[PDB]
Amino acid sequence: SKLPPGWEKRMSRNSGRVYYFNHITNASQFERPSG
């Protein structure tokens, strides 16, 4: 909803755990990122 720029909310396909990935830095993180 109110996520920072560059980060995107995605969902796994094997299990189904929601996570955040950055298309700019090309990395994922489970912990709510900041900026």
Side-chain angles (χ1 to χ4, degrees):
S1 46
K2 314 177 294 189
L3 262 52
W7 300 83
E8 229 319 289
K9 173 185 272 257
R10 304 253 303 161
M11 171 156 86
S12 217
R13 171 182 313 162
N14 216 134
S15 58
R17 259 146 47 71
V18 176
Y19 63 88
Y20 316 112
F21 170 74
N22 198 330
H23 52 86
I24 298 181
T25 30
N26 203 114
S28 212
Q29 188 171 230
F30 298 122
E31 311 216 332
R32 180 200 193 200
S34 181

